[PDB]
Amino acid sequence: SEHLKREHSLIKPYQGVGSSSMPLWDFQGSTILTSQYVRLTPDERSKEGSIWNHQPCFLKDWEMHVHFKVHGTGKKNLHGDGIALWYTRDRLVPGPVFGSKDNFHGLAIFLDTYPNDETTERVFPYISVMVNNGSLSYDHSKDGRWTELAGCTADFRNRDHDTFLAVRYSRGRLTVMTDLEDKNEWKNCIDITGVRLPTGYYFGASAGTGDLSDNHDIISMKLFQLMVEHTPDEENIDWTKIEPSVNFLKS
Numbered sequence: 001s002e003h004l005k006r007e008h009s010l011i012k013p014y015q016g017v018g019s020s021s022m023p024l025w026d027f028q029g030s031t032i033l034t035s036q037y038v039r040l041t042p043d044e045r046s047k048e049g050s051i052w053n054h055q056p057c058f059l060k061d062w063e064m065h066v067h068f069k070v071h072g073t074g075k076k077n078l079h080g081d082g083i084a085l086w087y088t089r090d091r092l093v094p095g096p097v098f099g100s101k102d103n104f105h106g107l108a109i110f111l112d113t114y115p116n117d118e119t120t121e122r123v124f125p126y127i128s129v130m131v132n133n134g135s136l137s138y139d140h141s142k143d144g145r146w147t148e149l150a151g152c153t154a155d156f157r158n159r160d161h162d163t164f165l166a167v168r169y170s171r172g173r174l175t176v177m178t179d180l181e182d183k184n185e186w187k188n189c190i191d192i193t194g195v196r197l198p199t200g201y202y203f204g205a206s207a208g209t210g211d212l213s214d215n216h217d218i219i220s221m222k223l224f225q226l227m228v229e230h231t232p233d234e235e236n237i238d239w240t241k242i243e244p245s246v247n248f249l250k251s
């Protein structure tokens with residue numbers, strides 16, 4: 001907690017919601033609050049909700065831990081659609097990508113609970129990452145097949161114990177880990193390198209329901225600064241002007 005950045009975190013009872021204090025997040029769309037959780041959508045159809053951090057993040061090296069809960073009463077496979085976690089240029093704009101805008105700038109981590117793709121080769125729920133410069137559209141009907149950078153299957157729905165995600169970004173390495181099995185352990189999901197993201201973007205979370213639904217709750221988001229060396233050469237460039245992109249190792 002020494003490196004907890006409170007201004008980039010969402011922690012109960014949620015600052016400024018139930019008091020005269022100033023809030024640290026904007027609550028948008030279907031989102032509602034209780035003293036115990038932020039609920040982005042209820043288990044009802046055609047909802048879109050988001051939360052957006054007030055201040056841009058200027059940390060070069062960070063790790064976000066998200067305590068979330070996806071749960072509902074839909075029978076068999078009749079539930080959806082999932083949660084998106086954002087580190088993006090823009091904030092507050094609703095849209096078709098789990099409740100937030102398409103053609104975004106920055107990083108998305110999708111926790112997709114419904115296979116829209118009739119010819120999918122993936123097992124759901126499926127957690128994936130996407131990096132965008134404004135040009136790409138998330139093809140919702142194909143579960144973002146064409147724009148997936150990396151991903152993993154993850155059993156996070158309707159669990160009897162707390163479920164957590166970690167997203168770590170430092171020196172181009174993007175790692176996503178899960179804690180879904182009540183083992184107090186981070187299990188790898190995604191670990192990739194060559195990911196270029198600027199400082200000055202906003203953390204956000206969103207969720208959407210369509211003809212299928214689920215409760216999509218965020219209990220906390222805790223952002224930690226990683227103490228990572230950058231040389232005077234590395235430090236001098238303007239990190240706010242980095243264009244979101246990915247460098248790829250050749251075959």
Ligand SMILES: OC[C@H]1O[C@H](O[C@H]2[C@@H](O)[C@H](O)[C@@H](CO)O[C@@H]2O)[C@@H](O)[C@@H](O)[C@@H]1O
Binds near residue numbers: 047
């Ligand atoms: O029918 C209203 C609903 O339509 C669209 O959602 C569709 C699809 O994208 C969803 O994955 C599934 C499962 O929830 O539902 C629909 O078939 C969207 O336009 C959505 O916003 C809307 O509520």
Ligand SMILES: [Ca+2]
Binds near residue numbers: 112113115116117
């Ligand atoms: Ca889907």
Ligand SMILES: [Cl-]
Binds near residue numbers: 010011013015024025
């Ligand atoms: Cl808060």
Ligand SMILES: [Cl-]
Binds near residue numbers: 043044045
């Ligand atoms: Cl409904």
Ligand SMILES: [Cl-]
Binds near residue numbers: 116141
């Ligand atoms: Cl569809």
Ligand SMILES: [Cl-]
Binds near residue numbers: 158160161
């Ligand atoms: Cl369980």
Ligand SMILES: [Cl-]
Binds near residue numbers: 179181
């Ligand atoms: Cl896990």
